[PDB]
Amino acid sequence: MDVQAFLTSQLEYYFSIENLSKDMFLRKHMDDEGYVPLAFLASFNRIKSFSTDLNLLHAAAKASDIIDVAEDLQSPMSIKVRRKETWSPWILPSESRL
């Protein structure tokens, strides 16, 4: 597929039940609203291999109809994303967070 298509697919996958059940790190880095910083997602080798550009990754996130993006004008690195909840939140207790 195209670079955008791959990046979008991976982003959707990252917040999937299958991935989350195996990837505790994503859950630990969630805030009270279940958001995960774009900068953290960019650290995934699968993403870096295609692009390290947060702008392209952000565009990929916006291309998904099941992902919501929160922007912070103060910094491009403070942009967070989340997948829409279906059954239950995957947010961990503050003490368990990193």
Buried b (16+ CB within 10 A) or exposed e, 49-72: ebbeebebbbebbeebeebbeeee
C-alpha dihedral sign at 20, 31, 58, 55: negative
Identify the burial level of 8 via C-beta atoms within 10 angstroms of its C-beta, where 0-12 means exposed, 13-18 middle and 19 or more buried: buried
State CA 86 to chain mean position distance.
16
Contacts of 24 (CB under 8 A, 6+ apart): none
Tell me the sheet residues that pair with 83: 67
> So where are the chain's domains?
3-83
3-state secondary structure of 52: coil
Please state which architecture CATH assigns to domain 3-83: Orthogonal Bundle (1.10)
Take residue 66 and report the two structure tokens written for it.
Answer: 């099941």
